[PDB]
Design an enzyme around this catalytic site. Structure first.
Site, short mmCIF file in Angstrom:
data_model
loop_
_atom_site.label_atom_id
_atom_site.label_comp_id
_atom_site.label_asym_id
_atom_site.label_seq_id
_atom_site.Cartn_x
_atom_site.Cartn_y
_atom_site.Cartn_z
CG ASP A 1 -44.11 145.89 39.13
OD1 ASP A 1 -44.25 146.07 37.90
OD2 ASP A 1 -44.79 146.47 39.99
CB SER B 1 -31.98 108.15 -45.05
OG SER B 1 -31.43 107.30 -46.04
CG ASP C 1 -30.13 100.98 -45.65
OD1 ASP C 1 -29.46 101.89 -46.19
OD2 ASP C 1 -29.67 100.24 -44.75
CG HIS D 1 -43.24 148.50 43.53
ND1 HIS D 1 -44.43 148.88 44.09
CD2 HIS D 1 -43.48 148.30 42.22
CE1 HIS D 1 -45.36 148.92 43.16
NE2 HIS D 1 -44.82 148.57 42.01
CG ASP E 1 -49.20 148.36 40.46
OD1 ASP E 1 -48.13 147.77 40.71
OD2 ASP E 1 -49.31 149.23 39.57
CB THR F 1 -23.49 108.42 -51.65
OG1 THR F 1 -23.79 107.48 -50.62
CG2 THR F 1 -24.58 109.46 -51.72
CG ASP G 1 -20.52 107.08 -49.06
OD1 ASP G 1 -21.13 107.93 -48.38
OD2 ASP G 1 -20.74 106.88 -50.27
CE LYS G 2 -13.98 106.53 -47.42
NZ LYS G 2 -13.00 107.03 -46.41
CG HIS H 1 -41.06 149.83 39.26
ND1 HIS H 1 -41.06 151.18 38.97
CD2 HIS H 1 -42.33 149.41 39.10
CE1 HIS H 1 -42.29 151.55 38.64
NE2 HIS H 1 -43.08 150.50 38.71
#
Ligand SMILES: Nc1nc2c(ncn2[C@@H]2O[C@@H]3COP(=O)(O)O[C@H]3[C@H]2O)c(=O)[nH]1
Ligand SMILES: Nc1nc2c(ncn2[C@@H]2O[C@@H]3COP(=O)(O)O[C@H]3[C@H]2O)c(=O)[nH]1
Ligand SMILES: [Mg+2]
Ligand SMILES: [Mg+2]
Ligand SMILES: [Zn+2]
Ligand SMILES: [Zn+2]
Lengths: 773, 39, 773, 40
Positions: free
Chosen positions: A553, A47, A66, A516, A673, A126, A119-120, A512
């Site tokens: 400005d 197995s 098996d 201005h 300016d 085994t 086994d069961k 400003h």
């Protein structure tokens, strides 16, 4: 035994050749190896049990049972639905896989590691066992056993030696298959990450759309029959009016599932991906508790605890109450489930991803958990992209709201327009404007100041005997004077609202302010008209040039570009170079965007592009550094134009090159300016005092908040140095502009002349200061 | 009954960079430009 | 050979196949050395097959394999291997056709190449080539040459050749599958870590790329690699294009990206890993940089190809450094260069990976890994662009909000209009006077509350002007004695009142008069209604302040219009859109130090003030009142059953929730207080409200193209009175009856409502008489 | 001349999604009157 060795070598050679048949399975080679070992050691029912790892704990499962000589492979193979699973702490197989060593037990009843479940299960007895794990790279792949020696009661050393010799080759075949499988797993994982990154970075979207894009793209690589994602509600805190009944005792407090950070487990959306048939995808908003994903408690468990749940034989579980029968009318039974949480940066649970039974019948190994965990981690990280998308949406909406509120505050109210465009006191018409445009032009042209009076055309103009409302009226008169309102059919009420809004945009700073801006606009008007520079530009260019001069400005805070850079202002972070100039240009274009203020409303699209470009050039040109960079190019243009003896030919030389027109426009805006230096002595003295006062306020504020020593120009304590410093300004900046403009045009000779007169006076005050020492 | 044992998220793998410290006019005119704040 | 030694030799090669740790070259050497003795031939060889730039090639790995020759001499290192293209040599032809080749008289062959013959000085006459092929890919070509004592070889020679290349194929397939798994694991880890570092946070190109490339340095098996980032500036400024357009500077010639930009590496991050690990960030690197000394990064930037180069200094096109470059002895041997592309296919950077750690030239797999990394880095630029857009949006929002306060905030002249310190303190310059003097003078100037009827429920703002309303608001704040208790600055209070006045728009109903009426009504409720008994002085100060700012900056439209028009307000605030906007703007006004009337309050007092502001302003909407009517009704019913007043006071004041509910209903009664005014006021206010609703209905009909409800339809104006009756019976009567029951002092308020309903019934009845005929 | 070099790969990752179309309190009589007044 020569024939025995020859046959053994040939059989092992064929066993190794069986791995070369593409399209087969390693289990066939392992099966033929097992049938030859049994024949060799005279045993039965050899197995192979494979080893898996789920939920971090290892287990073994049946793969070959098996095995006897002359036995069919398909009958000896055990499918995923009949396999028996043993944890490592139970069974001889589990201890063989745990110890990673050979275990030969002659009498199985003497070992407490024995398990009789097999086994069961089949009614087989085994009595003898020989087990070996297949270990490569410090990992166990399978456990190989030979059981119940038919002709003896004990497995001797020679038998164990033959066992080791043959499962060396079995280990070779298992290593080959394992390396191929791990290569496939990593290829799928890399493809999932690659495609998720492609879809996440495709677009900035919400959680739902992004997660749907990523999941539907990696669909082919999940390798699952069906999977879904349920997103939780992330609302952590309740509103006060929703909390009042809780705190009054009217409504009982919540009791039930809760996300670990403290939120309510509320799957507010489910996206189901059906892959077993028709590739159906469904979106359930506000799913019920009857939803097949949520019928079991697994998604709610993952939301409550944040674990990764791997379940095999899910309906057989008693805790979660999975559906034993078909989930839907179509036949589909849940077999294996893998549920993982999606986790935010703050470790909150954002969603739960559930992957149902695999395409093949095998359960979910550790590698599928690896792949799905990488996917969920990527989605949890892309939650940052989703959060950034939401934060961007909020910022955009807040900016739009703030700009609309600001525009409402800045724009001239109808009462302020009525103070200039007196439609009622002269036409007896109601508030609603049904008047013809020409009537408005006629009645406005009678209430505006006389251009010939108030010396609007002269360089000596002083705004001191004029109030600011008078300045607005004079500016609208200036716009009427260059003959652009009728030529470009701009509305009169729009022009009045635009100029009043422009006046209101100028702050209440010392120098400003609006006076201005009006002085610069008026100087541009005089340079165009009295200075005879209008011959170099079309009427549209003069229109855009005056409009740019008035707004050159706008919204000035009284601090120069250096203070913007040093204080790390938002203007400095938004605009890199020419900070204030770019701010003024942006705000002027924002004012022009509104239809009620759009003074360029009725002109062509190409004309509008030209006007916008001229606006940008004229406003950016007021940066004095740009003037210091392009003054030489202007000087070369003037030198070239001076040599021609015909005015028309110089006009032609300038006009056919738009670059020359732009250069002349930039120095025209620079000359405007600085025009205050060319005013008569009283005007220049008062304006220079205002400029010095503004610079001193900037210096005091700079010292107060920046903790830096101002330069002597902006320092108040050096106020007695104002005369001498002024002469430097006359000798360094302004004199080049006005000398080259006087050379270029004799009609701009008075400006320079005025400057020279001022240079006398500021010298007389300077020398006196040297006598004061 | 009881829930089966499950595995915690592997946040230790990414729980958590050198070189990131620096990663985020005329000759005579310069003095007078700095004097007047032009620069 | 006899069978016994054949079986022993087969077992020997079987044990040879099981490496259990080691190199495949030793096993391939053993088979080849065994084969020569089986084939009676000499000088077998291996030619490993690679693919670079999509062009496959073969390269010698084992040479001069003769029986019993020591391995070290047979193995050929990468420094001495010879490479053949598949169109050169019978090895190339066999790799192309993937078939066994056996030809005698190789000088007559059309595919034989004698370059190895002249290179080694050995002559070949009979050969046997057979490529190892797995999965359509050729791994190696095995060569056996120069049969001794015979010619033409034999069929059984090819049979044993194939039967030993079966072992060779097993070994080579094992090694290749392991190699593929390793490179796929490296690629997945590169993607995973790059994603983590990208989703760590939002950053720019440089920091994100550096993090991603530094984290993945362990998975790129390169001694040195680097990334160079090109300038992304598509277009130039106008003044920078002025010298080029004027023809004064020759136009740029040289390398250009496919988009047309100049190839200018602005920064080059070098990762040196061969000895000490260093990261060098060079901004604006010189042309002598070791990465840029050759033209390969510039070639990639110009073309966009993935360039693989083996033995780079041996090339003639690229001027690669033949000797050591960093004086550490490191010499360029193999180069791989890739471009990183923006979604629009622009080349952002060039990532150059220098010689491999193993020393072998870069094959298809390293090209695969690096191409995936550069593709990810190219996709990741969405996060960088989003970061830049986030910064731009945040800066623009901050700028817009700042220009809104300068516009909204009251000027000092408007402050001097109310707090006339100048005319009465003879200071005229600075507010250096004591706060006691300011409090006294403002107390003299402000109007008497008794004469102006500020304490009555019948108060009407119609006689007063808006400046009078500001003065009355400051008087109301003085009457509750919160100015002296909390040390509220007098000038700050005046400025805050004037700013709140200026914040209200000029809409028909929700103007400053509505805000003042609500504030005065709530002052009346606190003082005349005797509702102060439940509230502290600080709570009263917050509620009159929140009452004055409840409808601040109302645009004149309903919340339904905000939702239906998808305004930025609706996309920002999900529910209670306008109320949340008013709360946000009030908090924004309070954030200023010059406007914060709550300056001299503790942190807990300010938090209480903010919470009270939220409750009062959010409670203004009628949906919340319609939801929470019942809880106030239950509070009133509970307080009605008490025998004494102080028991009711304690019952209300123990629970903060009931105080919040009563404050919410007080807000609701205040914003609806216009119903309770006498008829001469209510008629005017009702027409104002109807006109505002009709304006909204006109906006709905014109903009949204939807038919308005009968409340907001002008054509239903004659249905105004009957609707008002409903408005009394459905909204106002509940709150006013509940407050009349709660406090008898509020009985006149409700009483007024009852009258106004009588009038609104009569105006309805006449309509019923008009529509009857 | 320069050596032959590999062309960049973009078609495979160049690459609409199903289900994305939808993935983007009072009493009985009150529900009509709240509409008349605009309360909702
Ligand atoms: N019926 C049957 N039982 C087997 C076979 N191989 C092993 N077993 C038994 O199955 C058992 C499972 O648990 P153990 O580790 O105790 O021991 C194993 C053996 O005792 C087989 O081929 N057929
Ligand atoms: N020196 C040497 N040359 C070889 C060996 N094996 C093959 N060759 C030669 O190398 C050649 C390379 O090109 P071909 O395919 O024409 O042919 C090959 C043979 O002629 C070897 O083991 N040693
Ligand atoms: Mg300026
Ligand atoms: Mg309101
Ligand atoms: Zn200016
Ligand atoms: Zn209101």
């Amino acid at each position: 035994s020569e024939l025995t060795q020859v046959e053994e070598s040939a059989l092992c050679l064929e066993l190794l050749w069986t791995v070369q048949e593409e399209g087969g399975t390693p289990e066939q080679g392992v099966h033929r190896a097992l049938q030859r070992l049994a024949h060799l050691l005279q045993a039965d029912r050899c197995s192979m049990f494979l080893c898996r790892s789920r939920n971090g704990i290892p287990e073994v499962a049946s793969r070959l049972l098996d095995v006897t000589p002359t036995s069919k492979f398909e009958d000896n193979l055990v499918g995923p639905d009949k396999e028996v699973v043993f944890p490592l702490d139970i069974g001889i197989v589990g201890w063989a896989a745990h110890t990673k060593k050979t275990h030969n037990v002659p009498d199985v009843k003497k070992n407490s590691h024995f398990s009789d479940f097999m086994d069961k299960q089949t009614g087989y007895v085994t009595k003898n066992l020989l087990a070996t794990p297949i270990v490569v790279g410090k990992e166990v792949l399978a456990v190989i056993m030979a059981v119940n020696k038919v002709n003896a009661s004990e497995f001797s050393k020679q038998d164990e030696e033959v066992f080791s010799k043959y499962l060396n080759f079995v280990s070779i075949i298992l290593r080959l298959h394992h390396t191929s499988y791990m290569y496939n797993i990593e290829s799928r994982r890399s493809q999932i990450l690659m495609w998720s990154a492609n879809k996440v970075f495709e677009e900035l979207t919400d959680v739902e759309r992004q997660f749907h894009k990523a999941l539907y793209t990696v669909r082919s690589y999940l390798n699952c029959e069906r999977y879904s994602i349920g997103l939780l509600d992330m609302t952590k805190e309740k509103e006060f009016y929703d909390e009042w009944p809780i705190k009054l005792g009217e409504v009982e407090p919540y009791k039930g599932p809760k996300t670990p950070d403290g939120r309510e487990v509320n799957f507010y959306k489910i996206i189901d991906y059906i892959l077993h048939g028709k590739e159906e995808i469904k979106v359930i908003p506000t799913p019920p508790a009857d939803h097949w994903t949520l019928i079991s408690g697994l998604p709610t468990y993952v939301a409550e605890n944040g674990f990764i749940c791997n379940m095999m034989n899910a309906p057989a579980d008693e805790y979660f109450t999975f559906q034993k029968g078909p989930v839907d009318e179509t036949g589909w039974v849940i077999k294996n489930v893998l549920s993982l949480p999606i986790v935010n940066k703050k470790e909150d649970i954002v969603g739960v991803a559930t992957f149902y039974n695999r395409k093949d019948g095998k359960p979910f190994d550790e590698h599928d958990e690896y792949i799905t965990e990488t996917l969920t981690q990527f989605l949890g990280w892309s939650l940052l992209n989703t959060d950034t998308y939401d934060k961007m949406n909020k910022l955009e909406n807040r900016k739009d709201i703030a700009q609309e509120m600001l525009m409402n505050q800045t724009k001239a109210t109808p009462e302020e327009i009525k103070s200039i465009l007196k439609f009622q006191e002269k036409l007896n018409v109601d508030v609603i404007d049904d008047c013809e445009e020409k009537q408005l032009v006629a009645i406005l042209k009678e209430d505006l100041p006389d251009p010939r009076s108030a010396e609007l055309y002269e360089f000596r103009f002083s705004d001191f005997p004029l109030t600011e409302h008078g300045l607005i009226k004079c500016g609208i008169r200036l716009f009427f004077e260059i003959n652009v309102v009728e030529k470009f059919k701009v509305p009169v009420e729009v022009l009045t609202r635009w100029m009043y809004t422009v006046r209101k945009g100028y702050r209440a700073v010392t120098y400003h302010n609006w006076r201005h801006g009006f002085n610069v606009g008026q100087t541009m008007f005089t340079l165009l008209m009295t200075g005879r520079l209008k011959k170099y530009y079309t009427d549209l260019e003069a229109f855009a040039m005056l409009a740019a001069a008035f707004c050159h400005d706008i919204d000035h805070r009284g601090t120069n570009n250096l203070y913007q850079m040093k204080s790390t202002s938002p203007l400095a972070r938004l605009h890199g170079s020419s900070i204030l100039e770019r701010h003024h240009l942006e705000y002027s274009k924002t004012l022009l965007q509104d239809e009620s203020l759009n003074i360029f409303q009725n002109l062509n699209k190409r004309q509008f592009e030209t006007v916008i470009h001229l606006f940008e050039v004229a406003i950016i040109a007021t940066d004095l550094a740009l003037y210091f960079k392009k003054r030489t190019m202007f000087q070369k243009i003037v030198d070239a134009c001076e040599q021609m003896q015909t005015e028309e030919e110089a006009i032609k030389y300038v006009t056919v090159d738009p670059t020359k027109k732009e250069i002349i426009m930039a120095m025209m805006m620079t000359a405007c300016d600085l025009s205050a230096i060319t005013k008569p002595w009283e005007v220049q003295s008062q304006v220079a005092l205002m400029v010095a006062n503004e610079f001193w306020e900037q210096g005091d504020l700079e010292r107060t908040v920046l903790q830096q020593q101002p330069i002597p120009m902006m320092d108040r304590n050096k106020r007695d140095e104002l005369p001498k410093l002024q002469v430097g300004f006359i000798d360094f900046v302004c004199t080049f502009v006005y000398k080259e403009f006087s050379r270029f045009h004799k009609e701009i000779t008075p400006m320079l002349s005025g400057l020279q007169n001022n240079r006398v006076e500021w010298k007389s005050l300077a020398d006196e200061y040297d006598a004061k020492m | 009954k009881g829930p089966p044992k499950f595995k915690q998220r592997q946040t230790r793998q990414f729980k958590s960079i050198p070189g990131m410290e620096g990663l985020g006019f005329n000759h005579l005119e310069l003095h007078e430009l700095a004097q007047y704040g032009i620069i």
